[PDB]
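Q:
Just now I want nothing more than another pair of eyes on a protein record. Here is the record:
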Amino acid sequence: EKEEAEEVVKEALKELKKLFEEQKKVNEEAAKELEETAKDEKVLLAARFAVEASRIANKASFDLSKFAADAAAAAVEAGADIERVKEVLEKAIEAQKEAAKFSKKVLEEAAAAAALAERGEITEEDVARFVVELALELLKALFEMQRFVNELAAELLVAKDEKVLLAARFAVEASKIANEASFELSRFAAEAAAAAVEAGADIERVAEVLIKAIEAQAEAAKFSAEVLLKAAAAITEEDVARFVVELALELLRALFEMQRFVNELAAELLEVVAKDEKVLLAARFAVEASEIANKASFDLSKFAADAARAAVEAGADIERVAEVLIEAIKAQAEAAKFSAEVLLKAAAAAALAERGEITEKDVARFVVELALELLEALFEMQRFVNELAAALLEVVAKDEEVLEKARKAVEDSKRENEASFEESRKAAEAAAAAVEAGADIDEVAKELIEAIKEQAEAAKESAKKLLEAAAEAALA
């Protein structure tokens, strides 16, 4: 029974291993042939990209297939109908074959556009667009495999306990929301490389940044698999809630690390594009301001999970705590996408300035109004997480004297967050009025960075005093 079920899993992983290394040898020999038809270096630079990126798609294909097998093995160890395990293993084998057929389809596009360009007609920008468009193709393909395999691993996770099943539902929900945000962050890194190619940047810098973004997806893909395999590797009702909080913190931490790595990939792509000094200062200002907003949002998401930690140690049930953590993770995903859209629009305006279509005052005006958009989105998240902390307090604060001190602390943070945005808004419309009067972007950006950091400082101190009140309410 279960021993035979463990025999089907090991043979499934055995087949997945040979499928992965048969496709490895097929693609590795298609790379030598791709080296032959690489007349001129630009074709070889694109051929080596398609080869290196296809080896990532094939390697990430097996890592996601092995995760499905390890998830199926864990199901057998803790009760499993063997026919639903065979069904999941069969679907994972088809996904490996499908991802293998795509890794070769990538090299088909490479060899086609290769000799086509050396024959003529195809310019280097079309080769540069081919590399960028291919980057989009693999990033989307890796996300679909991870979404499909995580769906299979969801069906596997066995609990036989409502509370533990609610925790498995949270792990599946939180990982799916984070994997969607990581895909959109890597997509913005590829959309930034598309604006750099159409602006005149060299494909060599664009190619290596895209490889950084492709590998970032695979590393986050395996991390999400390892945490979900920890979730399967499960008692105490409070240790289940402690797992949910620690899982929510790890995904928020990996999401910010993706926001940080992708933010730095945009700075590299702006350095090659922004050849003008004053436009480079606007690019470097928007890059830093966007990253500051990423830290502040992550600090506001970590405060929510820390407030949820103080709630589970006070005795709040897992169900309400899982809701607040779900709302916090998607709140960080909203900021991650919003901060990426702001930085994407900044790269476009810098490209317009490089082409000469807009002036430097237009770029200075644009990065200032983008700074206010980030200051508003940070303030809207401060009010959102403040509502979540007030919700968690309404469950743990039962003594009317404890509730009164807690509700007062929620109000004080509401006034502190509001007043901090007024300070950041006054400085925003002051820096905008300076741009129109002809003030140098160096001084405007310097004073706006200090305003954004001062709101981030006020947000930290407000969250510190608020988490303090929730902790004392838990002690009583």
User: Anything to note?
Assistant: DSSP finds twelve helices and no strands in the chain.
